[PDB]
């Protein structure tokens, strides 16, 4: 507390005017700005440009990027089990005991997965005790790495630590601690970082072009010709053949050679990092229709049925997957209510498609057919009056 | 299970009895005593059942700063310290250089037993005594040791118009259940009304903290002198001729503790202990007006506790009542075995030890006992404003497991089952005990008490500083008798206690208790 | 795995196995005991096992101040500083500035004298009680002064003080620190107590000592100059205690109040000792820990070991036996059934034991129920005060023999001893121990163990000194600890003769001679 407050007024003397004005703007509007920072990236570019909270959001994000930490820090916070796809209550507020079986359920839910943490979030530096707020039975105790954002700030009589979480986490362990006779879950997790761009699409385009400008020279002429077909209209025919169970129902050896060339081309240059991409998926990609009543997420029961059906599952696309680095909404698929967030491990096949001159693909990347995604989380937000969903999934090999 | 006062204890567990095990509150299922657990009850309009700084969960679960006694574990008996000061030596000097110096011994409860009046036979269900004056442990009375009665003025050639000085040795002790930090006694001296000089002590020169049980200076060590004090360095307490010639008579000097201040311990999140912002100054004035006082005097040690109880006339408070037996069971480490309470090995009972009451509470308890059909004072309701002293016998036999008389009693047979507490005696012939001066303190006062039944005249005969023989006819039930005497100096003859019955009477629970000291 | 307190070590690892290596915590599997690693036991209910301002992690991981003894790295011993006063030389002069009439004596300060000054032994010890009871138990706060260069002469002879005046007193003093703790801001107070009268109280302040008093060391660094009492003024005396001091009695040294702070490692560099005090944690420490004092013939140590309460289910605190408590308190090599210091063997039959009244009574109560009948296997309750005296001379007819003389009729070719071998008694056994190894005017006790596998085969012993005696010892099928007092005297006397006439069947083992106190010489 004393150390936290000390670098709170140590930070406060180096701040600027717009940064501090955004700081009190967040002080009065913490919850709404935090929920905005959760889900602002799925709107349009001009929706964000016309949004009222964006100037304060970028000033606070600049302040968080300015303040880096020198050493890894173990930090504490409280959050709902619904945040970690445990869409239920572990123990209620009148309950004080987290049983061994529900702790086993929490273990078997939150294990071996990477879970997203995005936006601004407050945390505590020392272990909370009796004199602190304990709203949830879930306390995570995380090793934040070096140079991560760090804002101790004194708000009235208290002090708080605000960060811009922009990373996934791997939950290494959870233990069953007791505070004031109430059972709490203390989570020892690891910060695992992935390359994400969200709305930063020009810099991701530059990275993909720098990583894939010489990729065309390394392919065979058969592979290069089939890639040119795919970016010149062959994606429709190839994906239609692949979804329709091609080699089994209606074998096409020319299309088999084509998809083999595309697969080997994607195998030519595996990606050098863990990446996070976005995809405007349709109901047809999830066994639904536009006329499906379950597709209307504006009611909560459709959201809950989608979470029950899809979270914690492995989903298979037998066709090549076309996604993009951008999370923003577009006129092509603002109608579609499904936004899929995909985490790709390092060394997986795939390539940046928009480095080739003469292609109208907007910052597009392609993934090999037959791929499987482990759906980790589903969240919700309101794009206009339309409830849309955020599906955090990870590519499993 | 809703919580009214913010203490995280379900209300159903506070209306019922509950214990703390596994650092949580579970209901008392009346099967945890053989485990060793004990039961508590907490009030719910306030998170503090008693007015100590520590809260009901912390107090009742043992989360306090560990230095206090184990008898304050319940949330009903608070923990505050009661310091005391005594003198162990006297020096009188005329130099601003003849000197006379002797030894003194202190008694914590001597003035409380000063004004108690004894009666032969208690002609009610009271079966006890009432003192006129109630004195705590914080004040105490002293006796100079053996000097063969020689005049104090033959060693000092001081006439009318001259002043001598006080030099002495003092000791600080505690009898409560708390250590008090930054000890500032600010005690005083009075000499039959008029004070000579108050005694002011500072924080660092005397011991900074002063834990209960042990003393500053420690047990078996030299008491702290008055010359080694910054106030009493160039001057001492002056005395005129009239005062010293008044002390030539059989009179005593007494000490009190007036007002103290200091901090108390607590716990910290970053650190562990801080004792700066704390204070006892505004917490004593709440405890002193809500609770009721119990004092006990074993011949080696005095204890006191302060147990809370409800006022009768007001529905608005929900502090639960207690009876006297349960109050002394919780306040003291009193094990209730076979229905009888034992502190460590001395039995504590209405039929085993002496109970002394003040004037005001005696009327109310005698009003309450008429409602009670058991006619025993351990079951009456304890209310706000009770002041009880209890004194242990030096020697008490119940013709049972507890026997401590230093000489065997003649003609004692315990082959009976109709005694009040276990077996009793038969006065088929006559009982006698010789007890010399070497087994007794010199120049004191005593009372001999017991229970008798006769389903005939009984003669008692006491050889003492004054011989006293008397008659008493007993009843078919039990009636308590008591007889006062005094003894004389060590080099004198003995104490012969004789009881001649009629062959068909029973005597049980016989005790000898110290009352006062005869003057000289 | 599961965490309770504000420490990394889980409650499963907080009990029944506790090892820290390379700043992580691991359990114990009895394999890497020879890798410099030990199994500890601590609480899982709180951070601090004892009253120290250090967690069980840091003191068992080395993340604390390095001036603390490594026996305090164990979590079951409380780090506790004790500051005592030794005195070495007395000078008496009649002047108030410092000419005048001066006398000068050289004294020795003994720590463990008044604890065992009123201890008397029995010829036969009842039950399994192989120990004694003191009138009063004292810690190492008090020092008792023995004048060695005292010829037959009254102190009045060197002063010729007649009626009302007297001389002034000056002395040479030293300040020792024996404990598992240092102290920095030195401000001690010590009373010169003369049998009930306070002569004066001396305060050393800060500048006369310096800002460090590490444990095990004095302010005069081993061999350095004695510190006279002039640097803060002289102390007077009167002509009433001069004959009282001359006849029988001695001046006692009693430390009263010692103030100081401790050092805590900060985030950046060296220790800080400004926001600390050895005045708050002390009563917290003393409330729970027991007291184990050990007194070697050349030095002493004393330890605060946290013990338990039996009369409650709620508390979870480690329990120890007496011998294992001594072992972890001081550091003892486990020989086969034996405990070792650097050279001294310690046991319940190889050292001498002192308890006060309460501890002796409750140990005698516990002795009724133990099926092995030893002191060292007694459950450790909070509030015991146990003193151990390492013997001056001790032999066992085995590897250890430190006796200056050689006996007569020594037969060590037998193995039915208390510890390994025994001695076959055939006739006499003579030791003629020269006096030069015995301190003047001291009370010494000879103790031994007797086993006679015969019905009435007995021996006599006979101690020849100035206060000689002949005793008749009756041994039984088991061993008795039999002890006899005698008094040494002034140096112009002969050797001490110990004869014993055996009957050819009796066996002796564990023969020791030890000191109790000093007898008052006539002056
Ligand atoms: Ca309550
Ligand atoms: Ca309550
Ligand atoms: Ca009886
Ligand atoms: Ca732990
Ligand atoms: Ca612990
Ligand atoms: Ca041997």
Q: Any descriptors?
A:
A: 397 residues, Toxin ADP-ribosyltransferase, Chain A, domain 1, 6-stranded mixed beta sheet, 11 helices, 15 strands, 32% helix, B: 520 residues, mainly beta, Jelly Rolls, 9-stranded antiparallel beta sheet, 5-stranded mixed beta sheet, 6 helices, binds calcium ion, signal (chain B)
Textual characterization of the structure:
The complex is a heterotrimer, with one copy of chain A (397 residues) and two copies of chain B. Chain A is α+β, with helices and mostly antiparallel strands and 397 residues long. Chain A folds into two domains: 189 residues, Alpha-Beta Complex (Toxin ADP-ribosyltransferase, Chain A, domain 1); 196 residues, Alpha-Beta Complex (Toxin ADP-ribosyltransferase, Chain A, domain 1). Chain A is built from eleven helices and 15 strands. In chain A, the strands form three sheets. In chain A, strands 1, 2, 3, 4, 5 and 6 form a six-stranded mixed β-sheet that branches. In chain A, strand 4 and strand 5 form a beta hairpin. In chain A, helix 2 packs across helix 5 and helix 8 packs across helix 10. The radius of gyration of chain A is 23 Å and the shape is globular. Chain A starts with a helix and ends with a strand. Chain B has 520 residues and is mainly beta. Among the domains of chain B are: 78 residues, no CATH class; 147 residues, Protective antigen, heptamerisation domain (Jelly Rolls); 120 residues, Jelly Rolls (Sandwich). Chain B is 8% helix and 29% strand. In chain B, strands 3, 4, 6, 7, 9, 10, 12, 13 and 14 form a nine-stranded antiparallel β-sheet that branches. In chain B, a hairpin with a 5-residue loop joins strand 28 and strand 29. The longest helix of chain B has 13 residues. The radius of gyration of chain B is 26 Å and the shape is flat. The complex binds calcium ion (6 copies). The PDB classes it as toxin. The entry lists the keywords Toxin, Clostridioides, Iota, ADP-ribosyltransferase. The assembly is trimeric. Clostridioides difficile Transferase B Component Dimer in Complex with the A Component. Chain A is Cdta (Adp-ribosyltransferase enzymatic component). The organism of A is Clostridioides difficile R20291.
